[PDB]
């Protein structure tokens, strides 16, 4: 399904994404916003045969297995299909994990070039929550 | 700055069958990221609740856990025979990660007194120089209890160690050992040696003693 | 089934490094993240830190300075190496996944400058033979050995039932464990009851007739 940008806010906020290893909830929905402007079934195929899944996007080459990608780590340990459900539970667990690592959000491109050094909480402010 | 985990209560004596629910409380905010472990005696620690309530598939469905922010709960609805033992929360949303003092859950029984012994140093130690009192409290229910030594009336501190039985797999019941190591020259310098152990079953302590002026 | 195993020196003298081996079965140490986690004496837990999949790293800060963990590909295991110990680093420790979900049988990891010692092992009986109710309780004192453990049984064991063998506790770097056991007045004197004592470590084997 497709979040409303407060609606997903505060379904991350409910998810523990707010200050997760320092990160503000803005981060967060900022880079859900570039990655698939809030859509949990959002899907994009790259060149190789991995598949970017779910509301952030996640590689299958290294975080999640389709049961068809060469080289599957599936760092996550979860099936990229849990990736596009409705319920962003299994996202944001992938996403926290992939944030653990010492690059942090910098896993995510889109969250360098558009939200990292903003003012991010500009993606919450005006939500009620 | 570390964040800090506060459990309670420390421990928690139930009847299989009962529903029990175990506090974890933060220093700081942590929103969800609060997760439960439970590890049993020679047993390395298992994780029953992920993020505060998410289910594990594979862990008994009478485990489930709410809470969010700075306060957590770890709940089991009607305890069964093989869930008792330590419980541990630990938080991840800042690092580092860090642990809650745990909380132990342990068997409810009937109330016991304990069954006090005290022993003598043997004539092998003494020749050796050295001169070990032994007072063993065995069986009791509850856990809590007070171990007193005293020699010639006045109560004795140092040189007092002791161990302590984990609850009785047979009879539910906990068993202690304490002892007051001297050298043989301090033993020898003094006469009534006593254990002294304070006890719920009883406002009147349990008493164990012998005089080197007899026997 | 993903599964850990920890190994390494039981026995660190202070101030040199301790080592630890995870080897990791059912799957690929570069396909996860990995853990060292340390339990100290009164059930205290410390997150000791972790290795990512690409090979970085995070240690307690309390830690920072004596800690490394690092892993090995080919091997597939994952180490944990920690300098300068002192007493307080004896504890248990434990590798597992990031995610919670395995982890190792752990191992003890004793932290002291005793050399192997031999115990000393002595009868508990009750002052003058003064036995007194319808049952008696004698016992047996385990002091100086080390390293842990030692093995106490009772009549070889043909005496099993109304016993309690004691944790042992750490006495001037030495261990000390006791053991009593209770039998109806009618079994002793009249019956022999001794008290059988092995330490491994020292090649001795005592017994002591009570």
Partial sequence: ????????????????????????????????????????????????????????????????????????????????????????????????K???????????????????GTDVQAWIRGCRL | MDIVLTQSPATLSVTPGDSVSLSCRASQSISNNL????????????????????????????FSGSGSGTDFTLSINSVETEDFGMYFCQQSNSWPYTFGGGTKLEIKRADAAPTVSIFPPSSEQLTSGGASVVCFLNNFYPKDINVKWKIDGSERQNGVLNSWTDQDSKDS???????????????????????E???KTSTSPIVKSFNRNEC | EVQLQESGPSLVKPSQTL??????????????????????????????????????????????????????????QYYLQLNSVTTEDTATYYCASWGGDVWGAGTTVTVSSAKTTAPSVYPLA??????????????????????????????????????HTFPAVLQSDLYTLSSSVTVTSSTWPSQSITCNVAHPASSTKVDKKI
């Fill in chain 1, 1 to 96: 399904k497709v979040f409303g940008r407060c609606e997903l806010a505060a379904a991350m906020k409910r998810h523990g994404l707010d200050n997760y290893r320092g990160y503000s909830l803005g981060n967060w929905v900022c880079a859900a916003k570039f990655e698939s402007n809030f859509n949990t079934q959002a899907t994009n195929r790259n060149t190789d045969g991995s598949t970017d899944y779910g509301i952030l996007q996640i590689n299958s080459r290294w975080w999640c297995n389709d049961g068809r990608t060469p080289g599957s780590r599936n760092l996550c340990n979860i099936p990229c299909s849990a990736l596009l459900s409705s319920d962003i539970t299994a996202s944001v667990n992938c996403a926290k």
């Fill in chain 2, 35 to 62: 997760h439960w472990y439970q590890q049993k005696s020679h047993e390395s620690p298992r994780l029953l609740i992920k993020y505060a309530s998410q289910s594990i598939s594979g862990i008994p469905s009478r």
């Fill in chain 3, 126 to 163: 009750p002052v003058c033979g003064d036995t007194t109710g319808s049952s008696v309780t004698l016992g047996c004192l385990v002091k100086g050995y080390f390293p842990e453990p030692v093995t106490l049984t009772w009549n070889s064991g043909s005496l099993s039932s109304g016993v």
């Fill in chain 3, 19 to 76: 080592s630890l081996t995870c080897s990791v079965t059912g799957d690929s140490v570069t396909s996860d993240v990995w853990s060292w986690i340390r339990k100290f004496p009164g059930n205290k837990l410390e997150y000791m830190g972790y290795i990512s999949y690409s090979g970085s790293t995070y240690y307690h800060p309390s830690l920072k300075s004596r800690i490394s963990i690092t892993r090995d590909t080919s091997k597939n």
């Fill in chain 2, 173 to 195: 019941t906990y068993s202690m050992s304490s002892t007051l190591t001297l050298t043989k020259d301090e033993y020898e310098r003094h006469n009534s040696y006593t254990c």
């Fill in chain 1, 98 to 116: 992939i944030v653990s690592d010492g690059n942090g959000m910098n896993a995510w491109v889109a969250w360098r070039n558009r939200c990292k």
């Fill in chain 2, 197 to 199: 152990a304070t006890h």
